[model samples]
Target: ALVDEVKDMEIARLMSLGLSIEEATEFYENDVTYERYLEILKSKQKE
Candidate 1:
């Protein structure tokens, strides 16, 4: 278990990916495996 604060755009970003703020805060705090969230970011993609 780790601790990092989730904030405005992050909350919005994760929510935009369909995660509730609870899921965003919890998973990013390093609880849940980020595969679901990770895909959203990567699927959104830089390339």
Candidate 2:
């Protein structure tokens, strides 16, 4: 999967910022597009 191309260390970095491992993992594993990822971030910001 293209997501697997992303580094685990990088995804773990996001965990430090309040994102769950599941969330980070899903983001990478779900074939999430860059644009969708950005939208997800923006949605989280408004929460």
Candidate 3:
């Protein structure tokens, strides 16, 4: 989504998860800081 919004949006590594533009927006709307998002991903690893 955001990728096409503005050119040059390269997919990059983020923790152990690949977040699409939609995921990034969800992170902001839910007030999930980058650290917190990583923590969530960490927990997901356990699952």
Candidate 4:
């Protein structure tokens, strides 16, 4: 899963609102789906 993959990236720390690995995992797994999660990720992208 992309969210699971995120933990290996340095940018996850910056993009995940300071969430720890555990918190990010919980939030992504329980509260988010791939479509909605990607949407939020893309929404913050710069052109």
RMSD for all candidates, in order, please: 6.7, 4.1, 6.0, 6.8
Error of model 4, residue 27, in angstroms:
2.2
Ranking by lDDT: 2, 1, 4, 3
How many residue pairs clash in each candidate at the backbone level? 0, 0, 0, 0
For model 1, residues 1-47, the per-residue Cα lDDT tens digits are: 24344355445656655665675666644633455666655666465
- Prediction 4 TM-score vs. true: 0.33
lDDT against the true structure, per candidate, is 0.56, 0.60, 0.49, 0.54
Error of 2 at 19 (Å): 0.8
Query: Where does candidate 2 clash, by residue pair?
Result: none
> lDDT tens string, model 4, 1-47?
45746544533543455454655655654646445665676677587
Off by over 4 Å in 4: 1-20, 45-47
lDDT for each residue of candidate 2 in 1-47, tens digit (9 for 90 to 100): 45654667556656655566776676754746444665677677763
- Poorest 10 consecutive residues of model 3 by lDDT? 6-15
For the record, the alpha-carbon RMSD of candidate 3 to the native fold, in angstroms, is: 6.0
Among these predictions, the greatest TM-score belongs to: 3
- Candidate 2 least-lDDT 10 residues: 28-37
TM-score of each: 0.38, 0.38, 0.40, 0.33
Report the number of the highest-lDDT candidate: 2
Q: Which stretches of candidate 3 lie over 4 Å from their true place?
A: 1-17, 45-47
| Candidate 1: stretches off by over 4 Å | 1-6, 31-36, 40-47
